[PDB]
Amino acid sequence: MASVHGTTYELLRRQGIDTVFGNPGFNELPFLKDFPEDFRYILALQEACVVGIADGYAQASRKPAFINLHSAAGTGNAMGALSNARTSHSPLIVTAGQQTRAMIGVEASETNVDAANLPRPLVKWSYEPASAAEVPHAMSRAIHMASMAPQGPVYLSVPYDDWDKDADPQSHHLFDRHVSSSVRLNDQDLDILVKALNSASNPAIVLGPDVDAANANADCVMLAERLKAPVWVAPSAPRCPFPTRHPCFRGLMPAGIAAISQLLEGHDVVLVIGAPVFRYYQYDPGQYLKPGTRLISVTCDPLEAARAPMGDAIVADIGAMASALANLVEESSRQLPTAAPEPAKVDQDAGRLHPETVFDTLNDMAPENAIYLNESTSTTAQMWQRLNMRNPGSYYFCAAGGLGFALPAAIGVQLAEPERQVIAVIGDGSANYSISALWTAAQYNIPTIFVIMNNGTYGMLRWFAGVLEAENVPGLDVPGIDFRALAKGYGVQALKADNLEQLKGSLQEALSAKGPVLIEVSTVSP
Amino acid sequence: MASVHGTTYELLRRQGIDTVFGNPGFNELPFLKDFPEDFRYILALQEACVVGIADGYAQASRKPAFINLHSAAGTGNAMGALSNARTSHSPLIVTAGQQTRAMIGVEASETNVDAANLPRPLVKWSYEPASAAEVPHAMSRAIHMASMAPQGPVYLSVPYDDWDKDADPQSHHLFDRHVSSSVRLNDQDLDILVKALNSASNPAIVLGPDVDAANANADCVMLAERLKAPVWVAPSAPRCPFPTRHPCFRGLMPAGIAAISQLLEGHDVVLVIGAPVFRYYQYDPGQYLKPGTRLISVTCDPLEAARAPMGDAIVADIGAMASALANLVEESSRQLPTAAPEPAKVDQDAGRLHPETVFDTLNDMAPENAIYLNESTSTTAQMWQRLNMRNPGSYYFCAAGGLGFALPAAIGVQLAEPERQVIAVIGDGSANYSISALWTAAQYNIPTIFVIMNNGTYGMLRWFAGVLEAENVPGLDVPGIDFRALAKGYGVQALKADNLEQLKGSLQEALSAKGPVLIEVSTVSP
Amino acid sequence: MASVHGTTYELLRRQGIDTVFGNPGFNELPFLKDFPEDFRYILALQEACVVGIADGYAQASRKPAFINLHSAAGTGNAMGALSNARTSHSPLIVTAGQQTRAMIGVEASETNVDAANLPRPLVKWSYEPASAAEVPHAMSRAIHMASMAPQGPVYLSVPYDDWDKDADPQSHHLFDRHVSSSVRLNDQDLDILVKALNSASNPAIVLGPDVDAANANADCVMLAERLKAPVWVAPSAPRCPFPTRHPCFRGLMPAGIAAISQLLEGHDVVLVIGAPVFRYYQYDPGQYLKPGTRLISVTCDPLEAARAPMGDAIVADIGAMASALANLVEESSRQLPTAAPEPAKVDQDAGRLHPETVFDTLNDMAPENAIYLNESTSTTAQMWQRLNMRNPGSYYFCAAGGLGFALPAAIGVQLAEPERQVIAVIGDGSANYSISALWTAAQYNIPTIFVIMNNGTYGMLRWFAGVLEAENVPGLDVPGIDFRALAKGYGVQALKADNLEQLKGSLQEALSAKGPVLIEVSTVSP
Numbered sequence A, B, C: 001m002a003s004v005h006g007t008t009y010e011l012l013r014r015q016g017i018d019t020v021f022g023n024p025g026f027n028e029l030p031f032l033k034d035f036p037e038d039f040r041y042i043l044a045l046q047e048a049c050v051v052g053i054a055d056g057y058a059q060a061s062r063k064p065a066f067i068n069l070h071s072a073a074g075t076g077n078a079m080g081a082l083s084n085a086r087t088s089h090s091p092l093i094v095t096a097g098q099q100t101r102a103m104i105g106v107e108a109s110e111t112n113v114d115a116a117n118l119p120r121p122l123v124k125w126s127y128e129p130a131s132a133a134e135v136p137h138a139m140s141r142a143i144h145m146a147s148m149a150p151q152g153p154v155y156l157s158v159p160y161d162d163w164d165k166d167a168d169p170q171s172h173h174l175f176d177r178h179v180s181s182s183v184r185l186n187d188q189d190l191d192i193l194v195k196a197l198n199s200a201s202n203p204a205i206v207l208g209p210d211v212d213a214a215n216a217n218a219d220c221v222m223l224a225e226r227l228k229a230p231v232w233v234a235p236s237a238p239r240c241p242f243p244t245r246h247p248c249f250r251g252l253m254p255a256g257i258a259a260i261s262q263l264l265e266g267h268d269v270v271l272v273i274g275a276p277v278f279r280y281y282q283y284d285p286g287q288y289l290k291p292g293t294r295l296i297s298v299t300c301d302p303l304e305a306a307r308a309p310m311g312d313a314i315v316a317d318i319g320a321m322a323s324a325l326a327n328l329v330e331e332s333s334r335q336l337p338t339a340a341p342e343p344a345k346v347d348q349d350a351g352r353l354h355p356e357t358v359f360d361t362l363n364d365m366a367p368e369n370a371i372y373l374n375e376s377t378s379t380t381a382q383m384w385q386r387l388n389m390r391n392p393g394s395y396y397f398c399a400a401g402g403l404g405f406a407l408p409a410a411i412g413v414q415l416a417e418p419e420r421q422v423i424a425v426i427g428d429g430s431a432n433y434s435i436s437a438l439w440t441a442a443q444y445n446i447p448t449i450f451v452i453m454n455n456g457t458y459g460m461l462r463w464f465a466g467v468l469e470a471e472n473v474p475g476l477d478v479p480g481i482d483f484r485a486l487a488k489g490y491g492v493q494a495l496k497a498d499n500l501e502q503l504k505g506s507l508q509e510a511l512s513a514k515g516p517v518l519i520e521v522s523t524v525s526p
């Protein structure tokens, strides 16, 4: 008779899973014992760092990732990272261990109380099974709920005595099941949409993160060339969906109600693909749209379609809808739009560096197929203007605004794409939230590059206190941190850059190295 | 007309509050502006470190502490620390900022979705108000629910546009309200209990953490001297409730069902005060009690009284019940029990240190009124046998077993007791969960001592894999960390100890220093 | 070996339970089979009627009641009745059946999905056990959580295959456990309260429903005679706590903010016992209290103490606090207050009846130890002025305002007090919500009297539309119902009254009858 342990590892290998991300405990020892030789284990020193590494690996490979944590204390330390995963639509399977079934009622040490309620309201599905023989059917529901459109995180809690009991022999029917959500709009209604696009006199296009997740980038290039139309990215962007030096590209939209209606004035039809309508930030009251403009939206999430304050909407898969529209529209006889001008070069003495100077130097020296990550909050507009990104899968930024994402996520992307060089740009404030993730890069020899921007302050918060007219606020400055000593503590090589000739030398050394490297850069205090 | 901002800071000063523990954000700038000169602000670099410092300050002062965090991402990073606060009964008031009321429905950047459900099921009370004028009445309910028996943590969420609006003038009736739960059992039923204690022929006493929280230690010494009875501490102990070298004291109980019924065999009446019945750990099946033994329990928590599997129970305040019993019982004519023997000295060469040798050296050199903290998981039984603790408020250990408590909590205790020296003993594994808290000690010049026990492994997990017969488990070792380099990174002085003569020299230097100090100790690999 | 079925019925008989209230189903047949001869079963035809009958029985006997329902559909039909039970503090144990453990995951017919979340937020405690051997320990927690101060309703869900399995032999330690919450304030603080009462120059007293629940009525009479002080009942009253023709009694308080501060002007100390502060209804803005008045409150519920907008508070048992204060205060030398005048008699022709005429006729003819219930919404002030109620346990009204309480509750009170005659007064609108409860009185021969007040309209709603200035509202009238035909349908004797001489004859017949009786009365349309 096969055990619950033997039946569960056979379901995982037949559904394509071969890696476990974790930090271990008492309640997990009977799951992890006798570990099979066709799987690999990746250790990290804190639970915010475990979930960040797994999130980077899933976004870059376009497939689900598997995680194992300890009871209530371990699940609780990770709830900030699960807030970023809800808004990026990331497919993550989260498991945690519970006490033996005979000692839950007396509340022994290590018991998880009312367990399915702890991660609500951040997850798609949450459960604790009623018997040992139900555990393989519960793992089947979790795999399929994470992978169906719209994609997201899920939770399962298991008592430690279940793994050594006998399984149900009829569980073999689960092993090779296949589920599809790859759908598009009916022929009669799709015909009405194409006729409206073919007769517009001044059209415009807006793109979001679900375009890069689906690999629909090349189909969106064909659509803009046929219509002869300008292209923008939607506000607070988590990914890059279009080549940034193509003649149709206009850059990042402003995040206010009145600023967006003035930008769209004079366009008769506006088409949105794979974004919310819209992720606003500052308070800027006015009109949602001006007279003469109509809007149409395509999305994978029913909650996005319901909460929009203007326009018509369609709920379907982004890959199947983009392929259909690109191959049906006519070639317009209008002329192609003109490419944006070359950015201005700013004046630089032989002391402390301007942020504009750091981005121009990276664009001259790095390879054409590099991957970038951003957690430098006061410099985002300059980064989008000065880096040429030609290929898919080339940019990531925290999707819900939560700090502690970019340092551990850069280690996960480099393990999924071993032939492309990864480069993470991070502020002095943001670097402390997840500092212990540096140990995982040194132990498994993963060659990421980390660039630290040191200005001595929480820079974006001083800017916003100015616009709200708020005086005498405490806690805005962070003096007296040595980032070269923190790297030596966890086993990582460290370099420094105080002027332009030191910055050029340090980047050329880092491109040649066989292990991970950190560089500390002195930047101008606003 | 007074504003909501002016009315809320007047309610806090009249109820005895003068300190704020925090990490700031966009949604909190209109609460923190114009900060008043009779309050102080304490900054930390991550939200697990903010809540740990506040928990140490509240436990040592015996009064409530006030906290301020940013939206869903900040609340989520702290949920592991709120798991420890539920089981220790700590009085903590947690506030977080929300988006402007006109932009919640469209879900703008920084919106907290279904906010009151996020920290359930860990808190006593959770709420988001319906209008700006209701905010001062909501802060009144939060202060009183945290302070009533049984004490615990609470949650409030506030939209940022509420602080500048007009208050209700009838809010002045809140300023000086007083609420009491200081109660004990009726005269007729208390008389029946005292008669049963006076006629027992071989009584025994068991004590828990709610005795030290109430300062009832001296009343429990008088009770044991009158009855002439032996005294134990209940399993997995979070605090110390009795002097450890008094002749009646027998030490820490074992954590198994069968081991506890054999220890109590031959005692006719057993009295428990201020503990659960009981916090078991390992699986050890048998009898709850043997024939001839009856049990009676006094507790402040109705859920503790309901879930016990044996005995009678009384629900009341621990301070008022201990004072009443101590002054009513008769003097027995039995002889006082004999004191425990002096511990054995183990053999030591001039290389790597045994844990037994480290505890004997601290007992010879430290002052008589020192305070200790423990997060060295494989050495807890040796620590309770070898340290003489004469006074109240002298020991703290993680109440729900969650790692990341002792390093930040040691900084909070030293700020509440500036005339007593604090000394924290911590393992190589446990030190990484909350490492960035070291910056807060250097910036505010708080003189704590940190002792690190370096064996290269997760030692308690290797021991338990032996007893469960579990072979080929991954992720149990942590090589290649330099703890002297991590201290220099955050601005803290560092020393080392590789033999007995180096350990004696390093402790004498640390007792003289005016700022914080870390010592790295080489210990024997099991 | 004893089964789970045998062990559970032995725990119920040793804790004092001998009656089951229910409506049966598929999932409950293995609990109800082999029913033991020392228990009785009471059937009703709908689940709102089952819970109403049990609520009346528990309030009149001052002990807990046991209930059994079918899965999600049966639990759902009863949630209006559980809203009334939360605000009256009623001790009710609610159980429901679930599908076999092997078919919960596939969601077979009759499965209850996420079961513990369904009755939140109305209950004190809610749970579904992890194994068959845990079921007797889960029933122990439910009995004790319902009975501890403050008292209220609880919920347990059980899979049908658990009842025939082997029990744990160590479950015998549960059978005779005893838990007490009978507590009062410490000697030093009680002394400060008595000194403030002894030196007041014009005191006043206010009483709520927790006084009648505790049987503290005679101790509150002694307190008012010693202080020489006037006595009021708090607004929207669910029970009667004082004799209504004693010289100190002043009647029912108005339900507005400004109306209550003007009534208390000139009183220096106001003492509240066993009520919320206060249950307001209409909008009436002004001062909470006027200059020269201080307030002090005694309550059994921490949420009542936290939410009051003015005064000091004490949390303790109502029976133990009333006995202590009554025996400690001094005899004042002031003169006793004067009794209220005899009510005015209104003019009556020989046609349709005024409500004032119906209440004067009941006070002349009924016995001195009768029990009354009220669900006639537009006539409550006239009922409190015209009925003389000398003894405890003599009045009940819906505690949360929810219609469908009084008809089934009158059947439960008559089964607990077989030597006192019960008389229920009910409106034409209110009688339809729970009409099928009439069958239970006829089948078990329970002799309640039902008086129906027929005016053809929702009378209280027409009055409130006048004060809000609301015109052209639909759905306010209910013509064409025959209440004598509905009684004959369910097997109950029926009489009628169209003038004063027919009303006197019908009441004298009903006082003599051996079974239940309904009387239909024609009343004046406002």
Ligand SMILES: Cc1ncc(C[n+]2csc(CCOP(=O)(O)OP(=O)(O)O)c2C)c(N)n1
Binding pocket: A375, A376, A377, A378, A379, A401, A402, A403, A426, A427, A428, A429, A430, A431, A455, A457, A458, A459, A460, A461, B023, B024, B025, B026, B070, B073, B074, B077
């Ligand atoms: C968990 C969490 N805590 C706090 C914040 C608020 N926050 C927004 S921007 C910022 C400052 C980041 O400073 P730094 O990385 O040095 O970049 P700079 O602004 O100096 O360019 C902070 C603290 C947040 N978004 N998430």
Ligand SMILES: Cc1ncc(C[n+]2csc(CCOP(=O)(O)OP(=O)(O)O)c2C)c(N)n1
Binding pocket: A023, A024, A025, A026, A070, A073, A074, A077, B375, B376, B377, B378, B379, B401, B402, B403, B426, B427, B428, B429, B430, B431, B455, B457, B458, B459, B460, B461
């Ligand atoms: C947040 C959290 N993660 C994981 C654990 C599981 N855990 C229990 S003891 C232990 C090992 C601690 O090792 P160290 O501090 O070096 O002490 P030693 O056992 O070597 O004496 C771990 C990881 C936990 N209790 N809490």
Ligand SMILES: Cc1ncc(C[n+]2csc(CCOP(=O)(O)OP(=O)(O)O)c2C)c(N)n1
Binding pocket: C375, C376, C377, C378, C379, C401, C402, C403, C426, C427, C428, C429, C430, C431, C455, C457, C458, C459, C460, C461
């Ligand atoms: C379940 C429920 N539905 C509706 C109401 C609203 N309601 C309050 S008073 C009332 C009218 C009752 O009319 P009737 O019993 O004839 O008495 P009358 O007002 O004519 O004296 C209604 C419907 C309620 N309280 N509970």
Ligand SMILES: [Mg+2]
Binding pocket: A427, A428, A429, A453, A454, A455, A456, A457, A458, A459
């Ligand atoms: Mg900065």
Ligand SMILES: [Mg+2]
Binding pocket: B427, B428, B429, B453, B454, B455, B456, B457, B458, B459
């Ligand atoms: Mg170790």
Ligand SMILES: [Mg+2]
Binding pocket: C427, C428, C429, C453, C454, C455, C456, C457, C458, C459
């Ligand atoms: Mg009516």
